[PDB]
Each structure stands twice: as C-alpha cells, then as structure tokens.
Amino acid sequence: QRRERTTFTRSQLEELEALFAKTQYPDVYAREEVALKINLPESRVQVWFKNRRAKCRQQRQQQKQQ
Amino acid sequence: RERTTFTRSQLEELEALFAKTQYPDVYAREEVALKINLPESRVQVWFKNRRAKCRQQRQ
DNA sequence: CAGGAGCTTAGGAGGGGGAG
DNA sequence: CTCCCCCTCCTAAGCTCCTG
Ligand SMILES: C[As](C)(=O)[O-]
Ligand SMILES: C[As](C)(=O)[O-]
Ligand SMILES: [K+]
Ligand SMILES: [K+]
Numbered sequence A: 001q002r003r004e005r006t007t008f009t010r011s012q013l014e015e016l017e018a019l020f021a022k023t024q025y026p027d028v029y030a031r032e033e034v035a036l037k038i039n040l041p042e043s044r045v046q047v048w049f050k051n052r053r054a055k056c057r058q059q060r061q062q063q064k065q066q
Numbered sequence B: 001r002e003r004t005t006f007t008r009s010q011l012e013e014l015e016a017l018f019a020k021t022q023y024p025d026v027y028a029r030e031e032v033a034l035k036i037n038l039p040e041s042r043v044q045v046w047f048k049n050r051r052a053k054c055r056q057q058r059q
Numbered sequence C: 001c002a003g004g005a006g007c008t009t010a011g012g013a014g015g016g017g018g019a020g
Numbered sequence D: 001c002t003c004c005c006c007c008t009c010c011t012a013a014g015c016t017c018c019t020g
Helices: A010-022 A028-037 A042-065 B008-020 B026-035 B040-057
Strands: none
Touching (some): A010 A028
C-alpha cells in the first residue's frame, strides 16, 4: 500500500556504497546489518543492490560508448 | 494493476502521437488512450517519460 | 490546484533453483 | 498452470523540485 519510493539520504548511501565495495552480492545477514545502520527495511537494501549492480553494468557500457 | 506493460502495438500508436507532438493536451491523449485501451493516466506518464528518453538521446 | 522537469526506485517478465 | 528463491533486463512509476 505504501510506496514512498524509499528516497535515500547521503548518510544512507554512504553505508550502502561501503558494503557494495566489499561485496556486490551480500547475503541476507549482510543486508540486515546495513539496513539497521541506515534505518531502512532490508527489502529496500536488496532492491538497492540490484539497482546498484545495474548501475555498475550501465556505466561500463556507457564508458565503451564514449 | 501495479504497473502498466505497453505492448508493441500500443507503442506504435504512442510513438506516432509523440512524433506529432512532444507535449499533447488531454484531448489528444484521450484519443490515443482509447486506441491502446489504456487509461489516459498511463498516456500522460508515458510522454513524461518519453520526453526524458528523448532529452537523454539528444546528448 | 494544474503543468512541467530530473532522479531512481520498484513492479514484472523470465532465465536458473525449490515445491505443489 | 500455480507459489516461493536466486539473478538480470526493462522502464513504469513516485517524489521533489520548479512554473504559472
Ligand atoms: C495536442 As492536441 C492540440 O491534438 O489536444
Ligand atoms: C544452483 As543455480 C547457480 O543453477 O541456480
Ligand atoms: K495532484
Ligand atoms: K540463480
């Protein structure tokens, strides 16, 4: 019912990108831990990593384009 | 009823109207909404997104 | 309240796995 | 065919900005 589209703050994005640096496919336990730090549901941080891995794929293609 | 999925035949009518006008008024969006059997709300969001996909490919 | 824009999150199809 | 799980590709959609 509620889709506030989970707009991430910079502090939230900071912990996310930190975990994304160590691992791009974190297990559920690694996703719960960062979800508590950023005070967000775990399901939002899994959709984030899914989108974040696409961003990595998009940028390598965008680089080969330019 | 959470997300519209435009078929190939619907995108033909939508991209055709977009060629005539990037910003269509509600009357024109209704005519194409009935052709594609989708609510005019989806037609407005499509053009809002169709203009961003055009400004993206302009650079 | 409308109309726009930029940004990016989030439903959905659909490959693999499990099951009924 | 259905229901979950993983994953990606695709892009409709929600929020926040502007503008009258
Ligand atoms: C975009 As019109 C003038 O056909 O409503
Ligand atoms: C066990 As598998 C990587 O084929 O889902
Ligand atoms: K409104
Ligand atoms: K898999």
